[PDB]
């Protein structure tokens, strides 16, 4: 059908993109990837990738979205049909990300529910779930003594199993919250995306205010300086291994949400002649600034913990996804009336999480209904379809709130939508646009839309820098391979690793497969067959 919507204002676009960027990918994921790799060694690859590839590819996503009014899949039909598989990859990635991204908000909701109490559970271990090795941090400094802030997590929230092979029972208490978050999601999406006026004034400022409060409460602590010194000092020995490179490289593709159908979908709602360049750059500044600032909040608390307990900074906390839930509650414990701030912190996490969720769920739905705008037209069809996707998302996410859930969540976070797939997708996107479709032709298109050509930084970042970086990391990872491990002490069975590589391949293979499907489906000799598909069609 001819109909296609557009933004009511440029502020709608800016708000939607700002909601899509800033979320748990900055305040939760970045700290533990930095901690796992020993602090300051992580920053050099981080900024090299940032300014070499990250921002140009984000601008490419937005401007492709704006040039051709279509979602993740149906624009490559108008850039280069032969390579259309990239959109199917870009939608599989979103489908897998939405499965596991909700579980963090499930845990946040459980903490919020536990928060409303006369005394915080993780303040003192008189409770039943704790081991006899428990000692309060005030006394742990005076051989296996452990802290209550860690025991609450592991023994009550996770109820952690001794291994992935031992799933145990499903924690109904967490399952009800996992369902509640999906109810909240549905009753926002089932109408449509909108800014809704005054609600944005509160939603868009409270979380940053709370983050600033957390930063100030963090730096004030007795041991912050040692944490910062650990944070900012590169250990060059670490750069000799591929992991510190690929984790830093893929963290940026994850944070900017560029290898996903979302950003293109958001771009597609703009007017053709709209100038987006400055907004893209300033929002990239916002994203990377917030991510960088959060480190001073985390590692100051970790240095305080190491100073109080008397251990090395690298030994003090979990080298895994629990780091934020171990760190911030320990800081919340250090303020008057802890219940107030405990409430506010998890409200802040929920507000940061909901926005990103809504934006990319809407992006997935937008990218998929454009395949069948008639069969899945407006009406009851959307009502059925959205639930048909969300219910399967719920029953898939349910697999990892069991007693063995954490070992599966780690496997998802390492392989699904957060690793090599992003390098693959970004390499092929840049390769297509630069070398097949033509950098000159695309620069002329950008000139026609914006009024000014993109310039050297974008041109060479697409043509040379990004492909070379993506090839280098991809080769370096496999010539110096090392297997995955949980919390730096747990080794995965071969079947778990095989499942992880299967999960990643399910995303990667869409690119080469669709090429064969398209090519075998066209008549005539192959040299004419490829010529028909290398030309814009729709």
């Amino acid at each position: 059908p001819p109909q296609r919507e557009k933004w009511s204002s440029k502020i709608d676009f800016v708000l939607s993109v700002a909601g899509g960027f800033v979320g748990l990918g900055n305040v939760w994921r970045f700290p533990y990837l930095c901690y796992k790799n020993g602090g300051g060694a992580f920053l050099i690859p981080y900024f090299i990738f940032l300014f070499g590839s990250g921002l140009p590819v984000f601008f490419l996503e937005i401007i492709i979205g704006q040039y051709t009014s279509e979602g993740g899949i149906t624009c490559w039909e108008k850039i280069c049909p032969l390579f259309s598989g990239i959109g199917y990859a870009s939608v599989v990635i979103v489908s897998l990300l939405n499965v596991y991204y909700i579980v963090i908000l499930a845990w946040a909701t459980y903490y919020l529910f536990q928060s409303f109490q006369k005394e915080l559970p993780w303040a003192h271990c008189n409770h039943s779930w704790n081991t006899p090795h428990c000692m309060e941090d005030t006394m742990r400094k005076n051989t296996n003594f452990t802290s209550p802030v860690i025991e609450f997590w592991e023994r009550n929230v996770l109820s952690l199993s001794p291994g992935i092979d031992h799933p145990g029972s499903l924690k109904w208490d967490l399952a009800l919250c996992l369902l509640l978050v999906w109810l909240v999601c549905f009753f926002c999406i089932w109408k449509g995306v909108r800014s809704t006026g005054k609600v944005v004034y509160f939603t868009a400022t409270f979380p940053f205010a709370m983050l600033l409060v957390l930063l100030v409460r963090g730096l004030t602590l007795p041991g912050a300086g040692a944490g910062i010194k650990f944070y900012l000092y590169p250990d060059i020995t670490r750069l000799e291994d591929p992991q510190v490179w690929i984790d830093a490289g893929t963290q940026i593709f994850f944070s900017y949400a560029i290898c996903l159908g979302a950003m293109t979908s958001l771009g597609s709602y703009n007017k053709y002649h709209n100038n987006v360049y400055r907004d893209c750059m300033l929002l990239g500044c916002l994203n990377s600034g917030t991510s960088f600032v959060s480190g001073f909040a985390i590692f100051s608390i970790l240095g305080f913990m190491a100073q109080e307990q008397g251990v090395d900074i690298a030994d003090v906390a979990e080298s895994g996804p629990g780091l934020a839930f171990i760190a911030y509650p320990k800081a919340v414990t250090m303020m008057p009336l802890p219940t107030f701030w405990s409430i506010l912190f998890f409200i802040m996490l929920l507000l940061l999480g909901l926005d990103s969720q809504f934006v990319e769920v809407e992006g997935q739905i937008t990218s998929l209904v454009d395949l069948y705008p008639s069969f899945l037209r407006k009406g009851y069809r959307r009502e059925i379809f959205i639930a048909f996707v969300c219910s399967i998302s719920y029953l898939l996410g349910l697999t990892m709130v069991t007693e063995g859930g954490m070992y599966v969540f780690q496997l998802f976070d390492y392989y699904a939508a957060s690793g090599v797939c992003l390098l693959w997708v970004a390499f092929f996107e840049c390769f297509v646009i630069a070398w097949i479709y033509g950098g000159n032709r695309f620069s002329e298109d950008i000139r026609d839309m914006i009024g000014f050509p993109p310039g050297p930084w974008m041109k060479y970042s697409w043509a040379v820098i990004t492909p070379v970086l993506c090839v280098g990391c991809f080769i370096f990872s496999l010539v110096k391979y090392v297997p995955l491990t949980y919390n730096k002490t747990y080794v995965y069975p071969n079947w778990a690793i095989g499942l992880g590589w299967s999960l990643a391949l399910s995303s990667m293979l869409c690119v080469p497969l669709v090429i064969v499907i398209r090519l075998c489906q066209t008549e005539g000799p192959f040299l004419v067959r490829v010529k028909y598909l290398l030309t814009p069609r729709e």
Partner: antibody
Amino acid sequence: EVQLVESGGGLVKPGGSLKLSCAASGFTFSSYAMSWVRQSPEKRLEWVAEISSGGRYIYYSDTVTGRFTISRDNARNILHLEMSSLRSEDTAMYYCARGEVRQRGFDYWGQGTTLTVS
Amino acid sequence: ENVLTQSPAIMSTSPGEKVTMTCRASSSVGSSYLHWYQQKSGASPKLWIYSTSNLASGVPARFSGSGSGTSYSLTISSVEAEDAATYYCQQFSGYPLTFGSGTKLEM
């Protein structure tokens, strides 16, 4: 450094046809977008047409959209304008302008050539 | 077609004063898409001001512009000899491109 010089122009019968050209030097002519602008004997400026770097995108003024054609010769750094039916209102001096970036205007102009109709 | 109207038909000035030229649009135009040009009598124009206040490569820097939305202006801090010319305001946000009626400074 940069140079622009138009050629062609003269007396023609009303309803006749004439072809103007604009040679360029001193810059990578394949990159910069080009436009034509004409000045009436009343000294009023009027925009005519624009053509993009690769000639893929072309725009026309409303009062000439049916009679004028704009084209390029990138291999020899020459710009062409072809007119099909010159009414009495078409007499003017035609300028050749290198307006690449829309946020920065027409930074270079040619000398221009006159066109008149009997 | 977004027509631009310039207020003063013509100006004559002694070399001891400052003046302002007004350019008014039929529809609002962004600040990044209005430029002013110089035309010396008997010669082809040249770019004078762009993006509503940025000064061209050789303009005497006594020139400055200000405005937004529907109305714009060009101002001269101090007029002087050899400043005589015809100045046009031009819209560049959308097609067709339009030039103002232009105004001439003499005397």
